[PDB]
Each structure stands twice: as structure tokens, then as C-alpha cells.
Short mmCIF file of C-alpha atoms and ligand atoms in Angstrom, two decimals:
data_model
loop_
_atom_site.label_atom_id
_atom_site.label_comp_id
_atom_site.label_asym_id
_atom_site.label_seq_id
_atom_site.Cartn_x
_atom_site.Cartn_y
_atom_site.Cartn_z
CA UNK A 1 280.89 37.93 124.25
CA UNK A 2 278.31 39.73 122.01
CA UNK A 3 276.34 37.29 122.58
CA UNK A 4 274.84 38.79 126.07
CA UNK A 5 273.75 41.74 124.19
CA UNK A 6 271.68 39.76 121.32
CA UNK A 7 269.33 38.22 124.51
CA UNK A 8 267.18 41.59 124.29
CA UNK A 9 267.10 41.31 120.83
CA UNK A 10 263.60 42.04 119.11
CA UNK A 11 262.82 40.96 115.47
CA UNK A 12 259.92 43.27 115.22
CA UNK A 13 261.50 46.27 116.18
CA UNK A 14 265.20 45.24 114.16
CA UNK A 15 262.58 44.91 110.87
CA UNK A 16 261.24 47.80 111.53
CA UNK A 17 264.53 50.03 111.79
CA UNK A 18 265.75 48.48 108.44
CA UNK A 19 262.87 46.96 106.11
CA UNK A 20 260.45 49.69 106.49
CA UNK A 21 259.84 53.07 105.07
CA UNK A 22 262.68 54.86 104.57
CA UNK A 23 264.83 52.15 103.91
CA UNK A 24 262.01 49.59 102.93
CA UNK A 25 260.41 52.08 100.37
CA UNK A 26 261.55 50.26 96.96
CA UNK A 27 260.05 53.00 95.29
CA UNK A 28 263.14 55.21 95.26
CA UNK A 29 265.70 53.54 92.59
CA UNK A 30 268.73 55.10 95.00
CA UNK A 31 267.37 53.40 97.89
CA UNK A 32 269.60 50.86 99.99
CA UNK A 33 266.56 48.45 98.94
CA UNK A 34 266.67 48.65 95.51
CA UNK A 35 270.43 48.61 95.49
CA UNK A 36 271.18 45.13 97.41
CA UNK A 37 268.38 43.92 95.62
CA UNK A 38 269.91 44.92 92.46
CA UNK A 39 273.44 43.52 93.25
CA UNK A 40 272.45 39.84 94.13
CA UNK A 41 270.11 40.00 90.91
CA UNK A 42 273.17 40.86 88.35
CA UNK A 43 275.15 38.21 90.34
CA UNK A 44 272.73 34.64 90.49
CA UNK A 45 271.98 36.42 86.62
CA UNK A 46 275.93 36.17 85.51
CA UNK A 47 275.24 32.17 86.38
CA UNK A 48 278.00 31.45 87.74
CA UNK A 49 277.09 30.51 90.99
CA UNK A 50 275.00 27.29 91.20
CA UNK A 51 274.43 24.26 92.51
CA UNK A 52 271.80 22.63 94.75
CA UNK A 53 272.71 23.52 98.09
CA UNK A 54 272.93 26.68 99.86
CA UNK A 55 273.15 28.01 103.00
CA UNK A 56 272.75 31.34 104.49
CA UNK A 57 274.30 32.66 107.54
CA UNK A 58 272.46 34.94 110.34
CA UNK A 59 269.62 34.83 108.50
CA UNK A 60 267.89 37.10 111.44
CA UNK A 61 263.88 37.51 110.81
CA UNK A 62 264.45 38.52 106.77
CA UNK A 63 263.95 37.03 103.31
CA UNK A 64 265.34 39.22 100.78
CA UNK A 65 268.34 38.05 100.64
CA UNK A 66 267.20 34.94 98.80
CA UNK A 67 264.57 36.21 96.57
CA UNK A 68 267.14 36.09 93.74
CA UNK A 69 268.83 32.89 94.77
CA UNK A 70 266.24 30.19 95.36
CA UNK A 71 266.32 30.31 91.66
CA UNK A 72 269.16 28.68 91.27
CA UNK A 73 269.32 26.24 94.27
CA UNK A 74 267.12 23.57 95.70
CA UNK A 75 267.98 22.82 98.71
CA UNK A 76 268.62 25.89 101.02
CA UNK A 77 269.29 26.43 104.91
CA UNK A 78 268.44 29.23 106.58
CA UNK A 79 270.02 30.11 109.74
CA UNK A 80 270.24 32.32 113.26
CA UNK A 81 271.14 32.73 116.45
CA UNK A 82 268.35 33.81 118.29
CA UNK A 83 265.34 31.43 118.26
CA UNK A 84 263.14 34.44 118.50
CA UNK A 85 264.18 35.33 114.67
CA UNK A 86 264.00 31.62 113.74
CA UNK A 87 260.66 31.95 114.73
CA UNK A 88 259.86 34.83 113.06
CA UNK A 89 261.24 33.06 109.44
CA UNK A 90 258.73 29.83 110.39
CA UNK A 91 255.68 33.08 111.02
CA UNK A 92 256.93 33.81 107.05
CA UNK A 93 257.56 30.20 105.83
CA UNK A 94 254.60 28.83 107.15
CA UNK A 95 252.12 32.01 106.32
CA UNK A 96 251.31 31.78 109.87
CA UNK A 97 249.59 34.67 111.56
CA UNK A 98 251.06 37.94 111.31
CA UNK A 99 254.54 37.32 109.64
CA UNK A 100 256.34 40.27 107.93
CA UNK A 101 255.54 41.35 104.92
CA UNK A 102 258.29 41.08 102.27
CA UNK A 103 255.91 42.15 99.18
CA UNK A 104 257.81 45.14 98.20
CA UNK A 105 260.42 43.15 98.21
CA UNK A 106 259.78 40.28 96.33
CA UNK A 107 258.03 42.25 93.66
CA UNK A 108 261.15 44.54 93.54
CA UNK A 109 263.27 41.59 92.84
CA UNK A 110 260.68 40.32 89.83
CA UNK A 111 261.20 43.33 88.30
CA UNK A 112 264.69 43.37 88.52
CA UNK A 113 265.52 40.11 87.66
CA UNK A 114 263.11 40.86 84.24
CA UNK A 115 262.28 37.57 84.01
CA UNK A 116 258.64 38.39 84.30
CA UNK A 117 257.51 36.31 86.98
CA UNK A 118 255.12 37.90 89.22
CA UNK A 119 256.16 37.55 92.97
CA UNK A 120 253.44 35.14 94.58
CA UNK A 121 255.74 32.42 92.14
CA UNK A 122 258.47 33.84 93.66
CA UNK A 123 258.13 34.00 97.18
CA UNK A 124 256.50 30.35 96.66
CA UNK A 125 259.80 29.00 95.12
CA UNK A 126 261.45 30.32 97.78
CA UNK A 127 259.31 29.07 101.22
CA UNK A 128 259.80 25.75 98.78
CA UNK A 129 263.60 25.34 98.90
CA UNK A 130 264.02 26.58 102.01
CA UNK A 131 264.29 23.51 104.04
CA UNK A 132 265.24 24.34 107.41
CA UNK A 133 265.98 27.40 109.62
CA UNK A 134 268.74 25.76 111.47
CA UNK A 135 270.56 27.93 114.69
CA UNK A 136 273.92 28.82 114.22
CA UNK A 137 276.90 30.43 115.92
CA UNK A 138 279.86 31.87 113.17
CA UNK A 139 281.62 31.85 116.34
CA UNK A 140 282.35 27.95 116.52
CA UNK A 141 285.05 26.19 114.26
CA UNK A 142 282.47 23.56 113.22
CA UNK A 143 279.36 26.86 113.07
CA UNK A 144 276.64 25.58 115.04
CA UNK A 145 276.28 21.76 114.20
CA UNK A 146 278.32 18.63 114.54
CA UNK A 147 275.84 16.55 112.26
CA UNK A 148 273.67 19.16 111.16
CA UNK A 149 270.70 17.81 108.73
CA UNK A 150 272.43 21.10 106.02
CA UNK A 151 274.25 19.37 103.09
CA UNK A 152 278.09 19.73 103.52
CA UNK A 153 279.96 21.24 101.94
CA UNK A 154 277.14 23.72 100.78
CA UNK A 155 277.36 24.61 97.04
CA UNK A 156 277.51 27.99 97.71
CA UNK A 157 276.92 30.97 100.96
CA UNK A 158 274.66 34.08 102.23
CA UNK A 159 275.41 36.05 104.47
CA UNK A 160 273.78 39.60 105.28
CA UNK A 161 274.62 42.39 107.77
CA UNK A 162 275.86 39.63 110.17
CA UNK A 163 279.76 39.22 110.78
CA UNK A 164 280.11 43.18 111.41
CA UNK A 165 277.74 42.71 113.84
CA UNK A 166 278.62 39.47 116.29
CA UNK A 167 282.57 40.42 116.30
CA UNK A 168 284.23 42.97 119.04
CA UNK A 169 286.74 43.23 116.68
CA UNK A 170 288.29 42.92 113.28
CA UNK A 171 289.85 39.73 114.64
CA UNK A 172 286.74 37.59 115.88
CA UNK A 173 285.73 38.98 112.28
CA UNK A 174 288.39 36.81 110.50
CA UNK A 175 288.57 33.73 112.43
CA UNK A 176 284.27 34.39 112.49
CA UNK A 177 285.08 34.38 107.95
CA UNK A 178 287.35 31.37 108.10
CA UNK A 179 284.44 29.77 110.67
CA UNK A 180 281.57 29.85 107.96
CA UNK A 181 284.17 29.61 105.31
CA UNK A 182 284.17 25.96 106.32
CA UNK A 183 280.82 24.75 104.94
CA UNK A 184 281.70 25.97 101.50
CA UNK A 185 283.15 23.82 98.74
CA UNK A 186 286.59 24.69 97.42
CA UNK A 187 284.70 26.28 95.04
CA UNK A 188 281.79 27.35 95.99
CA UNK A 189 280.45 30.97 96.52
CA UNK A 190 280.06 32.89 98.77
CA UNK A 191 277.94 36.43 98.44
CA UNK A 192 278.52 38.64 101.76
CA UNK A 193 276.83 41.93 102.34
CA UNK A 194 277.76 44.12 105.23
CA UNK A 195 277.57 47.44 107.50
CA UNK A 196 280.70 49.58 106.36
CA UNK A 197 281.95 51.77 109.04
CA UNK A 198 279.09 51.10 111.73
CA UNK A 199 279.90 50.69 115.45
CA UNK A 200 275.99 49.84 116.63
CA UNK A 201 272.80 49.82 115.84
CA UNK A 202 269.10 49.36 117.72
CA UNK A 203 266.49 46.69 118.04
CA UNK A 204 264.25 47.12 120.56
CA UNK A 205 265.13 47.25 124.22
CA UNK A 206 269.03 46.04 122.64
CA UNK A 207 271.88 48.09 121.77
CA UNK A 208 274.47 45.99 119.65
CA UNK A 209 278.11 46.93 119.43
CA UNK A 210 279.62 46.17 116.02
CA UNK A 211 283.17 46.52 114.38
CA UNK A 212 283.16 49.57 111.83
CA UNK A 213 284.77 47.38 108.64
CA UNK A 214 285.92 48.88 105.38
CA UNK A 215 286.25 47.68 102.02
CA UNK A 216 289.71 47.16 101.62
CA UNK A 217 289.53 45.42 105.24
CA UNK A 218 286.44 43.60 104.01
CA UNK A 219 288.81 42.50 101.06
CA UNK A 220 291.98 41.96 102.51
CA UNK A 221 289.91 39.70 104.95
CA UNK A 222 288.09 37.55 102.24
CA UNK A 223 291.58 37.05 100.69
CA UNK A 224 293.45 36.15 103.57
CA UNK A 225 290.30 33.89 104.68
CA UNK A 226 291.29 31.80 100.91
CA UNK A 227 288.89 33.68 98.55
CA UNK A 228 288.97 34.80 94.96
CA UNK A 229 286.75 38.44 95.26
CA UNK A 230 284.91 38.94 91.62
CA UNK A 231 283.06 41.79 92.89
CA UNK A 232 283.12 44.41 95.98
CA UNK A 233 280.68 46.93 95.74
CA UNK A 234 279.75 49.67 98.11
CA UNK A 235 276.93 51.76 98.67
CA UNK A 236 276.94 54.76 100.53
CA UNK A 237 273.85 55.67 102.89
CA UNK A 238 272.06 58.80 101.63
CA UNK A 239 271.13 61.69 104.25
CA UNK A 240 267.33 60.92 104.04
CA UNK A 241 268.79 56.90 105.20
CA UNK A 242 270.60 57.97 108.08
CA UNK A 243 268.09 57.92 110.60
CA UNK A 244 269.07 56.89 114.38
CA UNK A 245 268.80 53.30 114.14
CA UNK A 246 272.25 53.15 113.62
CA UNK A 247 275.37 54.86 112.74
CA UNK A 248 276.16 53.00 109.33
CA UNK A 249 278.53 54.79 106.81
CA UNK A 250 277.72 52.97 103.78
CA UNK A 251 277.10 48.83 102.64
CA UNK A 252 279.02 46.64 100.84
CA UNK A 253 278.71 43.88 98.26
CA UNK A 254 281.03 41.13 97.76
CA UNK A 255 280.91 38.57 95.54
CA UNK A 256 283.89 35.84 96.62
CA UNK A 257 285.26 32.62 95.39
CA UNK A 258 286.89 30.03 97.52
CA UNK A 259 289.95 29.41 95.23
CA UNK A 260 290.27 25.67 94.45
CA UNK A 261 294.08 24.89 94.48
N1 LIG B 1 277.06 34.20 117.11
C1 LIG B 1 276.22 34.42 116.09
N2 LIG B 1 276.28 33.64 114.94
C2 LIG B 1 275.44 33.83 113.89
N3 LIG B 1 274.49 34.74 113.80
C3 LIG B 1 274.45 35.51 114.98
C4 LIG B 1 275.24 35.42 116.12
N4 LIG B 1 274.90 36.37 117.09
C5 LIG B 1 273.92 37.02 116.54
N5 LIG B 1 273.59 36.55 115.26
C6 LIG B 1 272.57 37.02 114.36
O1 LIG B 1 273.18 37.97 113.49
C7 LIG B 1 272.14 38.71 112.87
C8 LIG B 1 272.62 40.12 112.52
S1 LIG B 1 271.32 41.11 111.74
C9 LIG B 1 271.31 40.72 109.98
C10 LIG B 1 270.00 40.02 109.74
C11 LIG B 1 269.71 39.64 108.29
N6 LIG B 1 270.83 39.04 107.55
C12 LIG B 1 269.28 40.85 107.45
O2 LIG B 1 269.94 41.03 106.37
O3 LIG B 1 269.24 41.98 108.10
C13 LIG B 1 271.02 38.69 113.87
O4 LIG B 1 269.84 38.10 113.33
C14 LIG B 1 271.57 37.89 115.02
O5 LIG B 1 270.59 37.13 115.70
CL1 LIG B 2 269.42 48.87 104.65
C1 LIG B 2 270.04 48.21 105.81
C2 LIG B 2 269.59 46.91 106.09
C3 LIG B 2 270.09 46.20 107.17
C4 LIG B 2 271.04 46.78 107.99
C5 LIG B 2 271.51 48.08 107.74
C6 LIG B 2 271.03 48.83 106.64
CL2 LIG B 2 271.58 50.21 106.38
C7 LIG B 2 272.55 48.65 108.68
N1 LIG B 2 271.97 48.89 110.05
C8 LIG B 2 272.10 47.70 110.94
C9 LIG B 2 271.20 46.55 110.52
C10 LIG B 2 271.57 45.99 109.16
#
């Protein structure tokens, strides 16, 4: 019942702890930034994920984790529990008044991706097919929607920093992969980034309890949730990363395929 705990959660201050200097300085190449960046770039680049929907799971109040996607889908769903963060994407989709800056970001991304498109095109493809910021619980059999106006079965899945973090346990964790697992076509893909061996981590006034994960957990668990894994990376946090926002170990990557047989 994590959910209590989320209530007191503030976007601002969440953005802050994790998209801001040190962690949201893209200058440094060895920078969590420039490494997640760097992973979904080499993936969407292999093209073997595409289609023309997508969706993205706990979305929270961030971007980047589409900047390299929205190239290959049309039609993409963003998502979130707390309206507060669904309100914070509309502040960035809709260039209303002081949204968050994702600059460094998107401009990382162009010049990863080295397809030399500057990032005004970018981040304008992507406020373009991203169609709705729908609210979601990976908690539900059916996550959050009975009818929901997101294309089923989505072509492919997102998720970032958000399973870890809305489980007690590695259990909720499963049946919370099998949940989301749902909306994806036998097979689609499904990119999943994560805290590795993290057990909280601030955001204002809240103080959320999350289940420290591994990678071989993280694996074993995409298997036994019917996935193919092509690729499970993980990045471990520097010194000069560690700062108290959190207790994170390291991040992972995976890139996994819902086996069609
Ligand atoms: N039951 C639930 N189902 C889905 N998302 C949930 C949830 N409870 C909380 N969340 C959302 O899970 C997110 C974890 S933070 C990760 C945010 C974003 N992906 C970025 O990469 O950082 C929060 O935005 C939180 O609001
Ligand atoms: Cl870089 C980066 C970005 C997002 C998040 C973390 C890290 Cl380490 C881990 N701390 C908890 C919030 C999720």
C-alpha cells in the first residue's frame, strides 16, 4: 500500500534530486545522463523495435525517456499515478508557464543519436506523438483503464525507475511486470530501466520505500514474466552521484521481448 506514501509526492523537488546538476549535467560522458541516454539511442537505432503505438509506464513529471523513441512511433501514451506529475507533463507538452526544462537533454540525445537534428525538431516530434498522459496503476490486472482511449495491444513499452519503486516487495514486482506486460503485443517490446539495489529515495516532504532489485532478479523476473531479454545493462552510480536523495547502488537497462509462441 505504497500508494499512501506517493500522496506527499512533489514533482519539483523529485526533478530536482534526479534531472539536475549532478546527475542532470550531460556534460560528463560517465554521467548516469549520458549513459541512459546512450542505451535507449543504440536500441530504437538497432530498429528493431517499431511500430505505431507506444506506451510508457510511470511516466512521473520526465521526458527523456522518449527523446529517442518518438522517432519511431506515432502514436504514444504517457502515463502516471499522481495527477500532480500528469500535470507537470501537460506544463511541458503544452509549453505552458514554467515547465521543466529538458534542453540538456534533448540536445544530448541529438547528438547521440548523430542523426543531426537539432533538438527544437526533436522535442517538437515528441510533444507531437504524445497523445495523452493517461493515469495508471501497474498495480491492477487490467493497469489503470477498462476502455482506455491507448491503442491495445501497444506496439511496444517504457518504463523508467518505476516498478522498483511502487512494490514492497520482489513479489508485487512480478505480478506489477506481468500487470503492464498485458498491453504489449506478443511481440512487442518492452525497454525497462530501473534503481538496482535501492530501498528509498526523497521527493519533497515524501519518503518512498522501494525493493532493492538486482540484475539477475531483474532477469529472472522478465523471463518468468514471458520475455525474450536482448540486452541487460547496468550502470553503477559514481561517488560524485551518490548524493542523499537516495541510496541507489547502480541502474539497469533492459531491453526485453515478449516471446511470440
Ligand atoms: N501504482 C502506481 N502505478 C504506476 N505508476 C505509479 C504508481 N505509484 C506511483 N507511480 C509513479 O511511479 C513513478 C516512479 S518515479 C520514475 C519517474 C520517471 N519514469 C523518471 O524516469 O524518473 C512516480 O512518478 C509515481 O507517481
Ligand atoms: Cl539518474 C537517476 C534518475 C532517476 C532515478 C534515479 C537515478 Cl540514479 C534513482 N533515484 C530514485 C529516482 C529515480
Amino acid at each position: 500500500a505504497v500508494a499512501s506514501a506517493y500522496q506527499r509526492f512533489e514533482p519539483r523537488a523529485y526533478l530536482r534530486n534526479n534531472y539536475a546538476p549532478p546527475r542532470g549535467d550531460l556534460c560528463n560522458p560517465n554521467g548516469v545522463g549520458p549513459w541512459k541516454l546512450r542505451c535507449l539511442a543504440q536500441t530504437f537505432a538497432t530498429g528493431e523495435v517499431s511500430g505505431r503505438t507506444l506506451i510508457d509506464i510511470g511516466s512521473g513529471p520526465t521526458v527523456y525517456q522518449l527523446l529517442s523513441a518518438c522517432s519511431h512511433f506515432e502514436d504514444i501514451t504517457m502515463t502516471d499515478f499522481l495527477e500532480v506529475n500528469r500535470q507537470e507533463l501537460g506544463r511541458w507538452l503544452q509549453e505552458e508557464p514554467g515547465a521543466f526544462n529538458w534542453s540538456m537533454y534533448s540536445q544530448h540525445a541529438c547528438l547521440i543519436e548523430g542523426k543531426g537534428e537539432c533538438w527544437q525538431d526533436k522535442e517538437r516530434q515528441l510533444r507531437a506523438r504524445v497523445k495523452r498522459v493517461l493515469p495508471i496503476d501497474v498495480h491492477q490486472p487490467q493497469p489503470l483503464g477498462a476502455g482506455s482511449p491507448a491503442p491495445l495491444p501497444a506496439d511496444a513499452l517504457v518504463s523508467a525507475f518505476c516498478l522498483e519503486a511502487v512494490s514492497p516487495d520482489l513479489a508485487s514486482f512480478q505480478r506489477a511486470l506481468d500487470h503492464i506486460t498485458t498491453l504489449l503485443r506478443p511481440g512487442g517490446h518492452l525497454l525497462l530501466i530501473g534503481a538496482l539495489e535501492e530501498s528509498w529515495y526523497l521527493a519533497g516532504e515524501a519518503r518512498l520505500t522501494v525493493v532493492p532489485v538486482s540484475e539477475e532478479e531483474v532477469r529472472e523476473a522478465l523471463v518468468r514474466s514471458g520475455y525474450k531479454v536482448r540486452d541487460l545493462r547496468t550502470y553503477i552510480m559514481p561517488a560524485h552521484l551518490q548524493t542523499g536523495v537516495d541510496d541507489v547502488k547502480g541502474v539497469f537497462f533492459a531491453w526485453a521481448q515478449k516471446v511470440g509462441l
